[PDB]
Design a protein around this nucleic acid. Structure first.
Length: 86
DNA sequence: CCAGATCGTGCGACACACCGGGCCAATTGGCCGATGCCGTCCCGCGAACCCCTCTACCGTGTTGAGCAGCAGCGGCCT
């Protein structure tokens, strides 16, 4: 749909804002991954490898999160982070 | 001295020498032909085997020695 240039600009701006929001959520939640991954230390894999795998798990969780359930975001992220790490 | 061993000689036997015949025994060894059991394969189903996915009270920090180059500083020079 052609729509109007101003509406297209506004839609692009909100899309960029949503991308920024996703990023911001990821940086805010990296500390949770770091906290979770420290109790699996040893057993071959090193600390930073575990942290990065947990980061991938957290990204996956953020890709599939909803707020209608009225629960704090830490729970879903914790489940997925532990699953990915193990 | 003279009589048997050795050998000469002789007669016979004769064990085969031949080189050629004319049949035979034993013993075949092929698979002929007919009959029968095993290797291969093509499913058929099912046990297991490996991979992927998701869970929402919440939870937010791991010696000695030798030789050479670089950083800081005292002190001219402008």
């Amino acid at each position: 749909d052609k729509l109007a240039p101003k509406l297209k600009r506004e839609l692009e701006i909100i899309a960029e804002d949503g991308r920024r929001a996703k990023n911001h959520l990821l940086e805010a939640n990296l500390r949770l991954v770091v906290s979770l991954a420290k109790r699996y230390t040893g057993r071959g894999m090193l600390f930073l490898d575990l942290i990065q795998e947990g980061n991938l798990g957290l990204i996956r969780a953020v890709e599939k999160f909803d707020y209608t359930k009225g629960y704090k975001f830490s729970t879903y992220a914790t489940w997925w982070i532990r699953q990915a790490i193990t």
